[PDB]
Every structure is written in structure tokens, then in C-alpha cells.
Amino acid sequence: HHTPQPCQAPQQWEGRQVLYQQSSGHNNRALVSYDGLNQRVRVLDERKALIPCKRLFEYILLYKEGVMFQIEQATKQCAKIPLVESWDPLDIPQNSTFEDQYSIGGPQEQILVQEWSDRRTARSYETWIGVYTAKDCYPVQETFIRNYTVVMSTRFFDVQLGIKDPSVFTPPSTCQAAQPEKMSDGCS
Amino acid sequence: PQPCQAPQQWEGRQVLYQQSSGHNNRALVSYDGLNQRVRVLDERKALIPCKRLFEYILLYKEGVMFQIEQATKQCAKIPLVESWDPLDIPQNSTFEDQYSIGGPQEQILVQEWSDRRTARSYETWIGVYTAKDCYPVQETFIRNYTVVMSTRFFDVQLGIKDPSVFTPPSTCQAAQPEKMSDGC
Ligand SMILES: *[C@@H]1O[C@H](CO)[C@@H](O)[C@H](O)[C@H]1NC(C)=O
Ligand SMILES: *[C@@H]1O[C@H](CO)[C@@H](O)[C@H](O)[C@H]1NC(C)=O
Ligand SMILES: *[C@H]1O[C@H](CO)[C@@H](O)[C@H](O)[C@H]1NC(C)=O
């Protein structure tokens, strides 16, 4: 009945994430470091299971200087990928549409979250949906829609405030050399 | 870390996502695992293209599902081939992970359980439930490493407020045996 205003989402944190992509129907787990103050992000592929072997990479997205580095985890072999997209923080735009509010879990173990979108009233057209906790405004889930169809969804877990170690945003020595082509998911 | 016991009767709300369509479908849901029956009521955040809204009453002990159009109460009777699978963690699940959603003043712990057999390369089901009380959060079905569908649960209230919700309306005598189409 009453419509909240967007809380401010914390702009430096580390935790874990599961990124789902429509086009493959796959989930990818990863450690994540998010520094919205310096507009940089680091993502380290994680495995729960060894079941199909995949190569594992670490990504360092430095938006100020328009590059993302992909880095093979064991070998430290690199790839300099032009990152040309504009910075877009993980937060709730002041003009977001309040969609809904609900609880996850159940009585005695629960948390209220709020769902926010960019859908204009009386339009049915969404490109972005973001779910954040109601008190601390921690990020819970983020979804990108194209033609009424989900393109990717990310869930966030184990969010801790601050950056334990800013050097994670420093690419290894091998990345000046860095090639230009993006390496492949599989050992196969 | 040990499989908890999901409650066998509750009501709340869900979002079902399907890979084939890339769509989300929102519903109110009453889950009655004692009587092996579910009631799903399509709900709407917005008016998009025009989709008809249905209510489904799934009665597994009887082998049938009733599809009921919400305004007109027009009704189909469709047999239920799928046998009953409760929304719980089998006592033989593989523990996958544990993590928190939220932060200091507002945090819950959830556990992720699965189907996977380590060293035999298969997994068809992943379930997320809260650690202490075993409330259901998310359920995902998998085929060859690829998500088929996933449902998220919210606003879970214990119990069934009114068991009549599983009693279909009179019209469901008129056993139109074809499922009603999604379009207007
Ligand atoms: C402002 O908010 C609206 C959501 O109603 C969104 O559509 C629009 O893109 C936002 N403006 C920008 C992107 O600066
Ligand atoms: C967008 O959605 C509509 C309706 O579902 C579909 O007919 C259309 O083909 C889609 N767009 C594209 C580019 O295919
Ligand atoms: C473990 O036990 C069940 C039977 O209760 C068996 O059918 C199941 O497939 C096993 N776990 C899985 C799903 O791999």
C-alpha cells in the first residue's frame, strides 16, 4: 500500500555469486570483489564440483581504464579484452519502480527483500530487475531482460563489507604482454 | 551438516522460471505434503501481452490436476502422470554449500543440497533451504548440466489457512479434457 524509496547499496564488498546465462542454460559460481568507488570488479571462478572439467579464470574489470583481464587460474596466462561498456553500479537508481516486497525463508528465519525494476508505469517493458534486502540494502539478485526474456541472472551471497585486499584488483605481470583473444571454457 | 526436515504444510508465493521460454511465472501456492496436493494460483505484476490466468489444483492421490480459469471458473480435468515428489531434502542428498543472504542486522543462512553423485557425472536437482528451519527458498531441475526450470519461494507461512482451496468448483464436473490455451 505504501511504496518505499530506494535504499543506498554498499559500494565496496566481497562475497560469492552465481551467474546464470539464458543462452547456455548454465550456472557459473564465483568469488566476487566489488569496488564501485573505483569502478572495478574482480570475479574468480569457483567449483563446488569437479563433475565436468572446466578451465577456470579470474576476471578483473577496470572500467576507468576500459579493459577487462581474463586470467587462467593455474598458469596465469592472460587476455586483454577491451571493455567498452559504461560503468553501471550495483545499486538502485533513484527513479526505479518499486515492484514488490517479500520475505525469504519463513517465520523465525527470514529476511525481507525488495524488488525494484526499470519498468515505466503502464508499460510492460522491463530490462532490469534488482532484489535487495530491506534493512541493509545488500544485493540479493540481479536480472537483465531483453525481449520479455531473461538474458542473465546473478545471485549474491556471503556479502562482507569492505575489500580485504585491494591487490586482487592488480593484474599479474603477464597481463602487459596480454594477448587479445578470449580463452575457452573447457579442458575439452 | 545434515539434511533438515522441510515443513509439510505451508502457503506462500513462487516464481517459476523456464529455460525453454526464458520466462518467469508468478503464483500464490498452497503446498500440502500430508495430502500430496498443491494449489497454484497465477498472479500478475503487470498486464504485458494478454495472458489468461488459471488456478491449478493438483491431486496426486487421485491422479488428477484441475485447471480453472480464474474469472469464469471454466475447468479442464487432466490426468497427472508424474508421481508425488515432496518438496523436502531427501535424507540421502549430497551437501553442496552453505551461505548467507544479507548482512549484519538482517541475515539468514541457507544450504544447498543436491542430487549429484561425486565421480559419476550426474545431477538433476538442486534445492536451497534455510539452515535452521528448513524453509524452501529455491528448487532447480537440471539435465546434462543445463537448467530446465527453477522455482523460487517467498512469504512462506506454516499451515494451510483453509483446506477448501483444494476443493474444485462445481464446473469441474464438466470435465473438458483439453488444457486451456495460454492466449486470449
Ligand atoms: C530513470 O529511471 C527510469 C525508470 O522509471 C529508467 O527507465 C530510466 O532509464 C532512468 N534514467 C536513466 C537511465 O538515467
Ligand atoms: C519478441 O517477442 C515476441 C512475442 O513473444 C516474438 O514474437 C518476437 O519474435 C520476439 N523478438 C524477436 C527479435 O524474435
Ligand atoms: C539417492 O536415493 C534415492 C531414493 O530414495 C535415489 O532414487 C536417488 O536417485 C539417489 N540420489 C540421487 C537422486 O542421485
Author numbering:
A (entry chain D): 36 to 223
B (entry chain A): 39 to 222
Article excerpt on this structure:
A total of four monomeric subunits of EPDR1 were located in the asymmetric units of the human and mouse EPDR1 crystals. The refined structures showed average Cα r.m.s.d.s of 0.5 Å among the four human EPDR1 molecules and 1.0 Å among the four mouse EPDR1 molecules. Fish EPDR showed glycosylation at two asparagine sites, and the human, mouse and frog EPDR1s had two predicted N-glycosylation sites that were all conserved. Although glycosylation at these Asn residues in human and frog EPDR1 was only slightly perceivable and was too disordered to be modeled accurately as sugars, the glycosylation at the two Asn sites (Asn130 and Asn182) was well ordered in the case of mouse EPDR1 [Figs. 3(a) and 3(b)]. While the sugar modification at Asn130 could be modeled with only one N-acetylglucosamine (NAG), that at Asn182 was sufficiently ordered to be modeled with two NAGs (β-1,4 glycosidic bond) and one fucose attached to NAG (α-1,4 glycosidic bond). Interestingly, although Asp121, Pro122, Asp124 and Glu175 are conserved throughout the frog, mouse and human EPDR1s, a phenyl­alanine substitutes for Tyr177 of frog EPDR1 in both mouse and human EPDR1s. Since the hydroxyl group of Tyr177 stabilizes one of the water molecules that bind to the Ca2+ ion, it is expected that the mouse and human EPDR1s would be likely to have weaker binding to the metal.
Orthologous proteins to ependymin called ependymin-related proteins (EPDRs) have been found to exist in various tissues from sea urchins to humans, yet their functional role remains to be revealed. All of the EPDR1s fold into a dimer using a monomeric subunit that is mostly made up of two stacking antiparallel β-sheets with a curvature on one side, resulting in the formation of a deep hydrophobic pocket. All six of the cysteine residues in the monomeric subunit participate in the formation of three intramolecular disulfide bonds. The EPDR1 fold is very similar to the folds of bacterial VioE and LolA/LolB, which also use a similar hydrophobic pocket for their respective functions as a hydrophobic substrate-binding enzyme and a lipoprotein carrier, respectively.
